[PDB]
Amino acid sequence: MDIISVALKRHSTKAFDASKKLTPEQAEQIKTLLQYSPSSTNSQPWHFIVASTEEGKARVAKSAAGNYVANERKMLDASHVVVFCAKTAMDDVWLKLVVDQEDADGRYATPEAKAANDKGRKFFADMHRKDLHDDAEWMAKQVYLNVGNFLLGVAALGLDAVPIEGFDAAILDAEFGLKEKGYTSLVVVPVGHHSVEDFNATLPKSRLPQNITLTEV
Amino acid sequence: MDIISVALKRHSTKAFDASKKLTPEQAEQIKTLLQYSPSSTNSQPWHFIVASTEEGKARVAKSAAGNYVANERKMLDASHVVVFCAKTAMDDVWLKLVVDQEDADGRYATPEAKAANDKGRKFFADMHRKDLHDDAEWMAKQVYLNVGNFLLGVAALGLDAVPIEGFDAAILDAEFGLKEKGYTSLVVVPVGHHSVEDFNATLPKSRLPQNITLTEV
Ligand SMILES: Cc1cc2nc3c(=O)[nH]c(=O)nc-3n(C[C@H](O)[C@H](O)[C@H](O)COP(=O)(O)O)c2cc1C
Ligand SMILES: Cc1cc2nc3c(=O)[nH]c(=O)nc-3n(C[C@H](O)[C@H](O)[C@H](O)COP(=O)(O)O)c2cc1C
């Protein structure tokens, strides 16, 4: 089926079949999607935790215990659980890693082109770090864009998923020592195959009409 | 084209062929993708401007005149230009439109299920607009998730696109009267077909290795 079929038919999975696992092929495919997301200035201001062990999933699921138990079971029963993390600050060392990797990949003909690109990336980075002091929000936005890309990609692979904001980020950060590493957890996405308990697999999709949300000019 | 091939072969178009237009089918398909993006609590806190006339695109392109000239040319040369807008405040009238639509689309068996889901959505909204005072940032994150969905989607339709943060949002908001309508422009995505001047169509994609960005547990 075409990508519009995928967009109309994917859903937020509310219950996962704990017997059904990604193939080793699908495990590699979902990591490719995470890696190859676009981002502003190719800043890639992100870390992914991909929990596939029973222990790893249980460690992520701690973030949902008590106040978010419906979300806790999705993290325990899915095959693979992705934690989307943003960097907590945009530093020149990260931007150097990115330009060096672009240089390794051969995107710069001359040291002058490499310098020009670094200069331009820094201009955008400084609008956030220095002028607006919103660089943490700007990086977080790029991570959400990756989630958007990710949810559509895993649906087109024929996999079930659910994006989760209902979790305790302080608990999840502490569990994986993310603050010390320069990251903060934003979104958790369990990936797998829905079970018969997934009420949402058969509910109609609901969106506002285009005559409310979309202007043509 | 499997979706991993789409993810690995899509690119940020640096120049559009102004003679190559979306087909009528494609023009409807890109609007479906905008509408059916997921969002936290199905909040859909967004407006889209789709500019396809010369006059409409020129009005968008004013936001990039002067200090973003490359971006200006992309907006003038693409077939269709999408302005992604966030709501500036999460109000109870928008939450009522959303739950009334979910009710009209058949997601609720009883008035009780509807009130229950309305109160659940209000708990989340209130965390942002009452506790954290970050509903503007929260809604802007949902719009960036829509953008991530959209860029992979249009690539799967065989269309070229580039996401643009390099514009003046104050000029664009003024040009369409967005502030008074309760919205702000976040990202501009020209859609169409790349030209011969698109140097980025023949460069390999560059991303940080998984051994930096990705921990398996
Ligand atoms: C939020 C966002 C804003 C962007 N803004 C611009 C822009 O103003 N101009 C531009 O030429 N490219 C822009 N890009 C494209 C990025 O530089 C590009 O996504 C990144 O280098 C990765 O390359 P790819 O998209 O070709 O995979 C933007 C990308 C994102 C995700
Ligand atoms: C950013 C984000 C966070 C979400 N958090 C949760 C969550 O904590 N629990 C949950 O069951 N669903 C969650 N969802 C799923 C949304 O309710 C869902 O995307 C929305 O109702 C649209 O329905 P669909 O995803 O089935 O198309 C989240 C979705 C988004 C986009």
Residue numbers in the entry:
A (entry chain A), B (entry chain C): 1 to 217
What does the paper say about this structure?
E. coli NfsB belongs to an extensive, functionally diverse nitroreductase superfamily, members of which are united by a conserved structural fold and fundamental mechanism of catalysis. NfsB family nitroreductases catalyze the reduction of nitroaromatic compounds, a step that is pivotal in various biochemical processes and exploited for bioremediation and cancer therapies. This catalytic mechanism involves hydride transfer from a reduced cofactor, such as reduced nicotinamide adenine dinucleotide (phosphate) (NAD(P)H), to the nitro group of the substrate, leading to its conversion via a nitroso intermediate into the corresponding hydroxylamine or amine.
Here, we describe our solution of the E. coli NfsB F70A/F108Y structure to 1.98 angstroms and comparative modeling of each of SN33623, CB1954, and metronidazole in the active sites of the parental and F70A/F108Y enzymes. Acetate was present in the crystallization buffer and has been reported to act as a competitive inhibitor to nitroreductases. First, the aromatic ring at position F70 is absent in the double mutant. Second, the side chain of N67 adopts an alternate conformation in the double-mutant structure, effectively widening the entrance of the active site’s entrance channel. Third, in the double-mutant active site, we observe the side chain hydroxyl group of Y108 participates in direct hydrogen bonding to the carboxamide/carboxyl groups of N117 and E102, respectively. Fourth, the aromatic rings at positions F123 and F124 are displaced in the double-mutant structure compared with the wild type and their average B-factors are higher, suggesting greater flexibility.
